[PDB]
Amino acid sequence: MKAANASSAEAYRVLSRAFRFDNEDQKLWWHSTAPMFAKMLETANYTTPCQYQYLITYKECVIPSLGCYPTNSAPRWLSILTRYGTPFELSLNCSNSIVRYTFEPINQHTGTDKDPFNTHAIWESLQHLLPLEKSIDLEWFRHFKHDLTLNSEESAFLAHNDRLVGGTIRTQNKLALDLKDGRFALKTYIYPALKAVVTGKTIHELVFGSVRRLAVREPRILPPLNMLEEYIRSRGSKSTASPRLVSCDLTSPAKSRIKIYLLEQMVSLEAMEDLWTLGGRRRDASTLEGLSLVRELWDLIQLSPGLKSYPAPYLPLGVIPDERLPLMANFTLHQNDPVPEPQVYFTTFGMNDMAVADALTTFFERRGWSEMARTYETTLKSYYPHADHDKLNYLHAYISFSYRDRTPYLSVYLQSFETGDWAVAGVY
Amino acid sequence: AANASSAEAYRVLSRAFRFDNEDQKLWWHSTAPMFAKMLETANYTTPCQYQYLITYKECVIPSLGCYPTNSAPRWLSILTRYGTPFELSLNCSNSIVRYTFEPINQHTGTDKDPFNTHAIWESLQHLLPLEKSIDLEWFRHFKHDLTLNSEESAFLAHNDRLVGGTIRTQNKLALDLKDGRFALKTYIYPALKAVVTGKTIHELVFGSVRRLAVREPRILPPLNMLEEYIRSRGSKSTASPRLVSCDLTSPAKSRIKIYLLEQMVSLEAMEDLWTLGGRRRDASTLEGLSLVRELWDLIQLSPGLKSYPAPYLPLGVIPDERLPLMANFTLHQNDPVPEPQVYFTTFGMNDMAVADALTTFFERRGWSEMARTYETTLKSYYPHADHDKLNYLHAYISFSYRDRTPYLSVYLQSFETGDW
Ligand SMILES: N[C@@H](Cc1c[nH]c2ccccc12)C(=O)O
Ligand SMILES: N[C@@H](Cc1c[nH]c2ccccc12)C(=O)O
Numbered sequence A: 001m002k003a004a005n006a007s008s009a010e011a012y013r014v015l016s017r018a019f020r021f022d023n024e025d026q027k028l029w030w031h032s033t034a035p036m037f038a039k040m041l042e043t044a045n046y047t048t049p050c051q052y053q054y055l056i057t058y059k060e061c062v063i064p065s066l067g068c069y070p071t072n073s074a075p076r077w078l079s080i081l082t083r084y085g086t087p088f089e090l091s092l093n094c095s096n097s098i099v100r101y102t103f104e105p106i107n108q109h110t111g112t113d114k115d116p117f118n119t120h121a122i123w124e125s126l127q128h129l130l131p132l133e134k135s136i137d138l139e140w141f142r143h144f145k146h147d148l149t150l151n152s153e154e155s156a157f158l159a160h161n162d163r164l165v166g167g168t169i170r171t172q173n174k175l176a177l178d179l180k181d182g183r184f185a186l187k188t189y190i191y192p193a194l195k196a197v198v199t200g201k202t203i204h205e206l207v208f209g210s211v212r213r214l215a216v217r218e219p220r221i222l223p224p225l226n227m228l229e230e231y232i233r234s235r236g237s238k239s240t241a242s243p244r245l246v247s248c249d250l251t252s253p254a255k256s257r258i259k260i261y262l263l264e265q266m267v268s269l270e271a272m273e274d275l276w277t278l279g280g281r282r283r284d285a286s287t288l289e290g291l292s293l294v295r296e297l298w299d300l301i302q303l304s305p306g307l308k309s310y311p312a313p314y315l316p317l318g319v320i321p322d323e324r325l326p327l328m329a330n331f332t333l334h335q336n337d338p339v340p341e342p343q344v345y346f347t348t349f350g351m352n353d354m355a356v357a358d359a360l361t362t363f364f365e366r367r368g369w370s371e372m373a374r375t376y377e378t379t380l381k382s383y384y385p386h387a388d389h390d391k392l393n394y395l396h397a398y399i400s401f402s403y404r405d406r407t408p409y410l411s412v413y414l415q416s417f418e419t420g421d422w423a424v425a426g427v428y
Numbered sequence B: 001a002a003n004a005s006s007a008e009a010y011r012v013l014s015r016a017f018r019f020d021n022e023d024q025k026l027w028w029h030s031t032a033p034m035f036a037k038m039l040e041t042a043n044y045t046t047p048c049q050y051q052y053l054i055t056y057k058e059c060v061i062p063s064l065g066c067y068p069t070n071s072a073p074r075w076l077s078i079l080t081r082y083g084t085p086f087e088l089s090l091n092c093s094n095s096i097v098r099y100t101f102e103p104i105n106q107h108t109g110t111d112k113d114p115f116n117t118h119a120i121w122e123s124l125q126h127l128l129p130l131e132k133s134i135d136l137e138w139f140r141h142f143k144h145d146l147t148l149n150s151e152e153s154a155f156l157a158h159n160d161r162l163v164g165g166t167i168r169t170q171n172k173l174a175l176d177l178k179d180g181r182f183a184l185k186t187y188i189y190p191a192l193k194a195v196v197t198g199k200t201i202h203e204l205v206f207g208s209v210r211r212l213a214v215r216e217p218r219i220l221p222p223l224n225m226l227e228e229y230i231r232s233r234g235s236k237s238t239a240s241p242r243l244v245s246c247d248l249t250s251p252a253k254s255r256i257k258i259y260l261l262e263q264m265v266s267l268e269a270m271e272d273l274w275t276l277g278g279r280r281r282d283a284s285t286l287e288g289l290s291l292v293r294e295l296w297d298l299i300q301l302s303p304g305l306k307s308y309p310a311p312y313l314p315l316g317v318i319p320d321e322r323l324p325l326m327a328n329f330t331l332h333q334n335d336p337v338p339e340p341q342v343y344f345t346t347f348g349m350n351d352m353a354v355a356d357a358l359t360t361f362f363e364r365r366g367w368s369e370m371a372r373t374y375e376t377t378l379k380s381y382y383p384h385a386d387h388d389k390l391n392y393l394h395a396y397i398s399f400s401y402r403d404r405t406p407y408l409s410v411y412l413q414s415f416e417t418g419d420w
């Protein structure tokens, strides 16, 4: 019985017939990622015009910022975005059927001596996106980018001394788009790790210092920021959780979230709960309903528990993972709520994909997400229709969970590379 | 322009050798150019070069498992950060080439031997007839006490939640190649023993040496001192027992070396290991301490507490990590004080910088040849590498100060060398 194949997605096929590509890399990027992208839009019930709209913006504004087509045979920028270092990833917000994607902007100067840590390329991507969406605001972006990524002089200093960082993934910042309502919302992610190296500060001081400075002009972010920092400090100097990155929405400050992400090396339900409740600071009924769903997801997904080291910096393409990763959580500073809001990440990368898709579909059924439950596995398989589906262990990078307005919110972050007809065209 | 693949013994043996599978052939071409070039530059005689390379090819290569690639199942050895089961070291102070490997056979990693506790017996069987001075008395003792038996293996295999991402290596062998003969050593990793028995690695190792000391009372004093030193570091010590080695030679000639992993990478940490927390303060200890400090100053290890790294790295992935220090303490039967050897763990550091540090140290000791040829030879092992960007060749530099002689070895990535 012939099976569904994302390369048959009509919007993918039509756009392929329409599009001008002026280099090979972009063309490869399009054919590598668009089948899954178009198929995901379709199955998430985006109207046909919206499928076209989003795939065109992606092709015209984003693909030219994904650098050369990734192979193991030629140099490429390795992005912190995925374990394979590819600078593009789709996520399906399953609870709302919203498609999002994240990319790390890369341009000609990325990784050359003019931008050895890729701290400049993001401006050029913003330049292409800004005219498309009136609501895009860069005020907070500029602030965090200035405080938390390498400037030019820090870059040249670290490039000369790059013995200090060896094989460190260099990503400074990434952008993501939430696709909704014929519009998009823009988000950024900023990785202060190398900024920490060069300033001799810790990522925590950088992140919290920058947010405090911002709270001078935006006092409403201060109360959740204070609670967050008190929670972190309370975990002590041997905490298994450490600040890793910060995100904010690129819209007006009044509407923008700041999200502070902790890497949590202890994979256990207890560690997850502690993050969820900020060590028992959140005891409200809403938190507790959310908590029952965290526990349910924990029990379905069956992550391998225990302390997890940092993984190998990246996996070459084609390499089957043999690893399990730290959890993650972010804490959102809402301006209308004094208590930071958590979102937790079940880091499934390396786990059996069909098992994980089964855990997901069970969770979907239980939530009454009838259609999600019905279509999820079939659709997932269609993204990689030539794979040995039962042996895949690298599609599901993360499952997110938060509980917003008494509403379960879940996204899956999926390997997004060499999809559809591409493939034909020990210790765990 | 030097290239290890031009090494004559490697070229000539490559014309001579029968290989019965691809894996052994790949292993030979992957490792032999560096191994032959290393023997050449360490001034081994032509006959020794051939002799060591042949025994290596015939007795050892068939025990290295499938050729390591990222795209097929292989045994992941603790021996290297890439899980490859072969590594050459050069004892720079004596020009002695040594190598370590983890025996692997057909049953390794299967339900007949899921933790690779049996393969070693087969490798020993191949080596024994070549070296009369091999003795297994202490080896049998330690392996018995410190590695999984068949029963514990099946239990652990059925309960591998208890293992998780842990590298499973039970035991390794090393050959010191001197004077047309070789001395055999073993390294025994009691980590999984500890899981199944409920013992700490400390209890296992010290318990095992104490049971041995019944038959060999002379090892007891340095063992008591080592243990008193370790106990003195308390339950939150950043140093803990990791492995044990002994020579596979007659007990009267055999050293037992107990290894501590030291997560605190600092000069202070290294000095404390060197002097066993101030218990060693004789002139010879202090002379050695000077050299330790000088090495410290030259090598410039990234200081601070180092976490356990990823269990292993995929081949081809350059590291971004810095690792704990190591030290071993030797129990000599004629000396009541355990003798330390410390390890500067350079893995992940810029290799040319480390090579420059080493060259300077060689100069200062007047190892004038060592200093002249080291960088050149090192480059010739990986002649197509972007040498200045390499940060994974030097795994470790060892140092001890033996009968008032500086003793130094470098442990080097030994994989895909020469014209690979
Ligand atoms: N790979 C990222 C985590 C991540 C996965 N998907 C993402 C999408 C957007 C931002 C971050 C992510 C990290 O290690 O930190
Ligand atoms: N890889 C070993 C240390 C080591 C490096 N080279 C060696 C050679 C022989 C024995 C041990 C080693 C460990 O992690 O414990």
Ligand SMILES: CC(C)=CCSP(=O)(O)OP(=O)(O)O
Binding pocket: A091, A100, A176, A187, A247, A328, A345, A398, A400, A411, A413
């Ligand atoms: C998967 C990880 C670690 C980060 C991305 S979180 P995100 O911005 O996608 O979160 P939301 O869009 O707010 O759900």
Ligand SMILES: CC(C)=CCSP(=O)(O)OP(=O)(O)O
Binding pocket: B089, B098, B174, B185, B245, B326, B343, B396, B398, B409, B411
């Ligand atoms: C490099 C590490 C951690 C261990 C091996 S020590 P070794 O047996 O090679 O030391 P010697 O041969 O006694 O100098």
